[PDB]
């Protein structure tokens, strides 16, 4: 029956579903989403950063704890797979992680968990850190690449003279220059999630080697 | 002093001060030049055209690697060099991500990195997965580091809120006895080119046993 942090966070995400651009998320907008005035949002949030911190924490809460089996490879795999599902459930999820500091217990214990799995498995403190942060990097860059390329492909398929023109120029160049490999590369889009798992298993196979 | 090169530069300068591509507008580029939007449009039909041109401008600066014919080594050279290229331009990752690779330089590089793998025996789908996964690694790697230095700056220049958050983080690690997160602290480190180089090698190491599992 009254304004709460939760009511605002939901409105923020609701706002992102409409306009999936985190930089466009302003306090006034979030206010108008609730039919209120910006000043009201500030009673619960000092600035946009405080709102982002809460949103990030909100996302973490939806993470599904993976079923661990004691195998460092599978377990870490289960973790990354579940983060892939999570980041696929909220708009700008990656940008939100990127733009905030993990100052919430939930996110911290997951990171500590993934790292321990590797440390307890015999990996160097430096190598477990590289591994875990590297896997996050792969997911971050893949999710946004996919998010931004989905839009581009949509604009092209939605009659967009310019980009369409760009796409044709691209395909002609590849052809006129017999760029075989790039040519077959276009073919794939390639099941996204499946691709991600393949990339991690590959990284994981590399750890196992040395 | 108006020309594509001048517009392009003004954009990058604009981003240097505030490396958030989402804030780049035709109206802001014009202001940066001391002109109004219409003038700019005579050079670019829209923001997307400016980005395409900016993506090209970035690729043109790609230092051609010296290859020897070995897939592991040559592919590593390409990534080391792409890592250097993305340290020279603000928002290089976001720009390549929000543009289609229709410019020559890009196509030549993508097709040739994929050529390194295909000729070495890697299946078409593993070559694609490998080449794009390495780019994904670098992209997330560079975006994460970019915000990092920005947040670090904000804290230092007196941002009390963020300073408080960094503090809370450490309090939780201690309150919940997060032993591994604590040791994780001593890593500045996982932001250096060698960390990226180590990440790429671990991936190429996996490749010597994957989709090699799917090769031949
Ligand atoms: Cl975003
Ligand atoms: Cl426009």
B198 touches chain A (CB under 8 A): yes
**Pairwise CA distance, residues A118 & A47, whole Å:** 37
Residues A61 and A73 grouped into a single domain: no
* Chain A residues lying within 8 Å of B127, measured CB to CB: 181, 185
Residues B91 and B185 grouped into a single domain: yes
**Pairwise CA distance, residues A71 & A121, whole Å:** 9
Residues B53 and B71 grouped into a single domain: no
**Which ligand has the nearest atom to the CA of A162?**
2
**Pairwise CA distance, residues A166 & A139, whole Å:** 28
**Pairwise CA distance, residues A195 & B195, whole Å:** 24
Residues A137 and A190 grouped into a single domain: yes
Sorted by sequence, the CB contacts under 8 Å of residue A165 that are 6+ apart come out as: none
B55 touches chain A (CB under 8 A): no
Of A121, A143, A123, whose CA–CA distance to A131 is shortest? Answer: A123
Phi, psi of B20 (to 5 degrees): -140, 90
Strand ranges inside A26-160, DSSP E: none
The residue of chain A nearest to residue B135, with distances taken between CA atoms, is: A141
Residues B132 and B209 grouped into a single domain: yes
Structural domain that includes position A206:
68-210
Among B49, B125, B168, the residue with its CB nearest the CB of A103 is: B168
Of A34, A156, A10, A135, whose CA–CA distance to A78 is shortest? Answer: A135
Task: Find which of A75, A77, A112 to mutate to test the B interface (most B CBs within 10 Å of its CB).
Answer: A112
Domain stop point among A12, A42, A67: A67
**Pairwise CA distance, residues A131 & A128, whole Å:** 5
Residues B101 and B37 grouped into a single domain: no
Alpha-carbon distances of B179 from A78, A107, B170, B191, rounded to whole Å: 21, 14, 11, 22
B105 touches chain A (CB under 8 A): no
Alpha-carbon distances of B131 from A23, A47, A133, B71, B113, rounded to whole Å: 30, 40, 20, 12, 7
Q: To which residue do tokens 């180590």 refer?
A: B198
Domain stop point among A67, A85, A120: A67
**Pairwise CA distance, residues A32 & B180, whole Å:** 43
Q: Check A142 against B136: CB less than 8 A apart.
A: yes
Of B2, B1, B49, whose CA–CA distance to B26 is shortest? Answer: B49
**Pairwise CA distance, residues A98 & B91, whole Å:** 14
Residues A29 and A105 grouped into a single domain: no
Q: How many CB pairs under 8 A join A and B?
A: 226
Residues A177 and A123 grouped into a single domain: yes
Among B130, B143, B165, the residue with its CB nearest the CB of A103 is: B165
The residue of chain B nearest to residue A169, with distances taken between CA atoms, is: B102
Among A22, A94, A210, the residue with its CB nearest the CB of B205 is: A210
Q: How far apart are the first and last CA of chain B?
A: 56
Indicate if the alpha-carbon torsion angle B132, B138, B140, B142 is positive or negative: negative
Residues B19 and B105 grouped into a single domain: no
Directed axis angle between helix A48-61 and helix B160-175, to 10°? 30
- Please state the domain count of chain A: 2
Resolution in A: 2.4
Residues A139 and A41 grouped into a single domain: no
Domain stop point among B11, B40, B66: B66
Q: How many A from CA of B26 to the centre of ligand 2?
A: 7
d(CA B58, nearest CA chain A) in Å: 17
**Technique used to solve these coordinates:** X-ray
Among A163, A201, A204, the residue with its CB nearest the CB of B48 is: A163
A184 touches chain B (CB under 8 A): yes
CATH number for A159: 1.10.357.10
Residues B89 and B134 grouped into a single domain: yes
* Chain A residues lying within 8 Å of B205, measured CB to CB: 205-206, 209-210
**Pairwise CA distance, residues B29 & B34, whole Å:** 9
Phi, psi of A48 (to 5 degrees): -60, -30
Residues A122 and A156 grouped into a single domain: yes
């Amino acid at each position: 029956p009254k304004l709460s942090k939760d009511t605002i966070i939901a409105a923020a995400f609701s706002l992102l579903e409409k306009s999936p651009t985190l930089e466009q998320l302003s306090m006034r907008k979030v206010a108008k989403q609730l039919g209120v005035q910006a000043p009201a949002i500030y009673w619960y949030f000092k600035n946009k950063q405080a709102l982002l911190q809460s949103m990030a924490e909100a996302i973490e809460e939806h993470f599904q704890e993976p079923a661990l089996c004691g195998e460092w490879y599978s377990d870490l795999l289960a973790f990354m797979e579940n983060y892939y599902d999570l980041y696929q459930q909220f708009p700008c999820a990656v940008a939100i992680e990127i733009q905030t500091v993990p100052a919430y217990p939930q996110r911290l214990r997951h990171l500590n968990q993934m790292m321990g799995i590797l440390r307890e498995a015999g990996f160097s403190p430096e190598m477990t850190h590289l591994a875990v942060t590297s896997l996050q990097h792969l997911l971050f860059g893949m999710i946004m690449d996919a998010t931004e390329e989905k839009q581009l492909v949509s604009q092209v398929l939605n009659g967009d003279d310019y980009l369409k023109e760009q796409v044709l120029h691209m395909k002609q160049y590849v052809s006129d220059n017999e760029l075989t490999y790039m040519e077959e590369s276009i073919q794939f889009r390639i099941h996204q999630k499946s691709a991600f798992i393949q990339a991690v298993k590959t990284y994981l196979d590399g750890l196992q080697a040395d």
